[PDB]
Curated annotation (Swiss-Prot), chain B:
UniProt function note: Subunit of the fusion protein that is processed upon entry into the host cell. Mediates fusion of the virion and cellular membranes by functioning as a class I viral fusion protein. Contains a viral fusion peptide that is unmasked after S2 cleavage. This cleavage can occur at the cell membrane by host TMPRSS2 or during endocytosis by host CSTL. In either case, this triggers an extensive and irreversible conformational change that leads to fusion of the viral envelope with the cellular cytoplasmic membrane, releasing viral genomic RNA into the host cell cytoplasm.
Effect caused by changing residue 29 to N: In strain: Lambda/C.37
UniProt-recorded name of the protein: Spike protein S2'
Shown stretch of the complete protein: 831 to 878 of 1273
Annotated source species: Severe acute respiratory syndrome coronavirus 2 (2019-nCoV)
Disulfide bridges in this chain: 10-21
Region (Fusion peptide 2): 5-25
Chain residue ranges for the region called Disordered: 1-23
Length: 48, 48, 48
């Protein structure tokens, strides 16, 4: 995690990432997809 | 230099900084010169 | 089959299970318990 001030590009600076998870799950990984929330309000139709 | 290594001197971690100690564990051992750095200095001084 | 408590141990129902701590070398989901000793410092000692 780092502080930043720009959306458009990745920073030209160096910081290593440290290990949170290390599980012996054994499942191979070919593909993936991101999870991101959608907003809805009175303005939106709210249809799923 | 000044080939004196206290066994307690390493004890744990620290062996890492001291490569010489690491070798000392190692089976490999540096043997001090017959003429110590001080003696060599005296000899070089004698010659000089 | 006849689950009854009256029956003798052979024929009687089975209070039994089996598990692999298992020998095959592989990554480990689980292993048998490790024992531990006191942390003996300052002395020359074998250690794990």
């Amino acid at each position: 995690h780092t502080p930043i001030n720009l959306v458009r590009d990745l920073p030209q600076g160096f910081s290593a990432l440290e290990p949170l998870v290390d599980l012996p799950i054994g499942i191979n990984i070919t593909r993936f997809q991101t999870l991101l929330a959608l907003h809805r309000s009175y303005l939106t139709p709210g249809d799923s | 230099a000044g080939f004196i290594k206290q066994y307690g001197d390493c004890l744990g971690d620290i062996a890492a900084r001291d490569l010489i100690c690491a070798q000392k564990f190692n089976g490999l051992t540096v043997l001090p010169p017959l003429l110590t750095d001080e003696m060599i200095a005296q000899y070089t001084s004698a010659l000089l | 089959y006849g689950f009854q408590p009256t029956n003798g141990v052979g024929y009687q129902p089975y209070r039994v299970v089996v598990l692999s701590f298992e020998l095959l070398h592989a990554p480990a989901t689980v292993c048998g318990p490790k024992k531990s000793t006191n942390l003996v410092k300052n002395k020359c000692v074998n250690f794990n």
